[PDB]
Amino acid sequence: APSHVPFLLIGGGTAAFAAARSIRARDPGARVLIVSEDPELPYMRPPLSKELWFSDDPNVTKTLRFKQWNGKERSIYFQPPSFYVSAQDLPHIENGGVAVLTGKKVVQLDVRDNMVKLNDGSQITYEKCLIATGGTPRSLSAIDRAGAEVKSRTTLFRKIGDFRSLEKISREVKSITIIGGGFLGSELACALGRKARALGTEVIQLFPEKGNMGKILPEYLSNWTMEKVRREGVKVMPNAIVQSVGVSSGKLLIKLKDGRKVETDHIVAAVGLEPNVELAKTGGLEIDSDFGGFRVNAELQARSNIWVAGDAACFYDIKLGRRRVEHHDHAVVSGRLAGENMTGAAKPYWHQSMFWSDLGPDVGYEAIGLVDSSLPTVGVFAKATAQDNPQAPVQGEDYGKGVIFYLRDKVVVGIVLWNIFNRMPIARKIIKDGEQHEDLNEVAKLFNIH
Ligand SMILES: Cc1cc2nc3c(=O)[nH]c(=O)nc-3n(C[C@H](O)[C@H](O)[C@H](O)COP(=O)(O)OP(=O)(O)OC[C@H]3O[C@@H](n4cnc5c(N)ncnc54)[C@H](O)[C@@H]3O)c2cc1C
Ligand SMILES: NC(=O)c1ccc[n+]([C@@H]2O[C@H](COP(=O)([O-])OP(=O)(O)OC[C@H]3O[C@@H](n4cnc5c(N)ncnc54)[C@H](O)[C@@H]3O)[C@@H](O)[C@H]2O)c1
Ligand SMILES: NC(=O)c1ccc[n+]([C@@H]2O[C@H](COP(=O)([O-])OP(=O)(O)OC[C@H]3O[C@@H](n4cnc5c(N)ncnc54)[C@H](O)[C@@H]3O)[C@@H](O)[C@H]2O)c1
Secondary structure: OOOEEEEEEEOOOHHHHHHHHHHHHHOOOOEEEEEEOOOOOOEOOHHHOOHHHOOOOOOHHHHOEEEOOOOOEEEOEOOOHHHOOOOOOOOOOOOOEEEEEEOOOEEEEEOOOOEEEEOOOOEEEEEEEEEOOOEEEOOOHHHHOOOHHHHOOEEOOOOHHHHHHHHHHHHHOOEEEEEOOOHHHHHHHHHHHHHHHHHOOEEEEEOOOOOOOOOOOOHHHHHHHHHHHHOOOOEEEOOOOEEEEEEEOOEEEEEEOOOOEEEEOEEEEOOOEEEOOOHHHHHOOOEOOOOOOEEOOOOOEEEOOEEEOHHHEEEEEOOOEEEEOOOHHHHHHHHHHHHHHHOOOOOOOOOOOEEEEEEOOOEEEEEEEOOOOOOOEEEEEOOOOEEEOOEOOOOOOOOOOEEEEEEEOOEEEEEEEEOOOOOHHHHHHHHHHOOEOOOHHHHHHOOOOO
């Protein structure tokens, strides 16, 4: 660990890596240090809830290689270890390169003196710095307030480590319960459901909302989705409010506020994330009270010499207003954009990032913009043409293929492409134009629906 380094990147996930690759591309001589709390070198997370589960290789938990949707096999890691330079070496080695100081944590930040202090006492000074701290899984107070007995049987899910433990458990218990109906809970339910199909074991998913992906999708579509998650071999329990959790003769017992009791062997809790904003205290950086995370401008800049990117960044979108996005692709785009800006670029966030998700073979979608079920929607499908806050939506209908528009005024500000491939460039085009559209059935033709 050197005492000075030109570019300091705090946090060793997706955003930070994208930043490093970007800086090097715009300054082929650059010297970049990543300080990373995790012992692991930068890796992507999506395969931990999706592809690593569907691998036919039994060695998959050691190899950590997966197949992409298009044949090509690869590693979970961004680069092979042999592509980074030592932390000690980084000041000298000609041409520079990227170093990763693994297993250390930044615990104090002094913006005045361009300096960080590590948890071991080390101090580093910097010319340019990026916070890319990500966030931590939220906990359930019903679990927080229980005993060792309970907590020992409870998983949060974020790291490679978590994928090794849960994969092991799935192979040796009879029943697992997922608590949460968002992205992680739902994707996990499917992966575990396809696994339980072989052994005839059970998988329960329960949550407060009426159906999966309640905070993202309109009610009709969220309902349609839940039915598909069931068909993956999952026992879905909507409208469940967890009251308490204890053990009874070696088993977990979940008690719902409705009087029902759920018995199970293990619990995974997917109930959102808390953005990692500890450094904001000592650094004296503005936190956003509405969205959470560090408040930064359109260029991801907080103070001079310091930028924020990824899950921890609340930024200004010139086109869609202030936001904070927590998705893989956004981490890449914003990390890459901060890299450019740390090497003088000065460009505002403009190329919109996107996301995607899959729940069994029949639910596959991509999305862009402000995609929030609390906004008015207009949806258009190969069966019906439904509006929600050309008529009001009917559950039980066929919703296998369509596009859903999310509105502010007459302006489309978010789109979800529902089992439709290869039309993302047009979704981008529509968000960018920001026209007040007369008839959205016209706009929908752009996506081949009809
Ligand atoms: C299982 C899983 C599946 C996902 N799948 C998808 C998907 O399919 N599609 C999609 O769009 N998104 C998905 N996401 C989101 C994706 O994982 C991105 O990683 C995340 O949105 C952005 O990563 P980031 O670099 O901003 O933060 P992170 O990847 O969280 O990295 C931050 C790193 O900083 C370290 N750190 C924190 N504080 C400090 C500190 N103070 N000092 C030093 N180090 C610190 C943390 O340990 C962490 O390693 C998924 C997430 C998970 C967990
Ligand atoms: N495909 C994807 O984009 C994808 C996949 C996996 C993970 N991720 C990321 O992983 C992170 C965390 O995943 P997540 O699904 O936990 O976050 P999330 O925000 O999607 O989940 C929020 C869900 O937590 C549940 N919840 C909140 N409070 C609860 C409570 N008190 N009791 C019971 N349930 C409660 C609700 O069901 C709510 O919908 C997110 O950043 C997510 O974007 C994304
Ligand atoms: N779009 C997706 O469904 C998807 C899937 C996995 C990962 N990602 C991630 O998103 C980022 C860039 O997005 P991208 O859209 O250019 O990724 P990509 O390179 O996979 O896109 C290529 C095209 O493949 C299309 N496609 C056609 N048939 C598909 C199928 N059967 N299953 C999945 N996709 C199919 C997608 O719609 C996309 O337009 C990358 O980080 C990538 O890893 C996207």
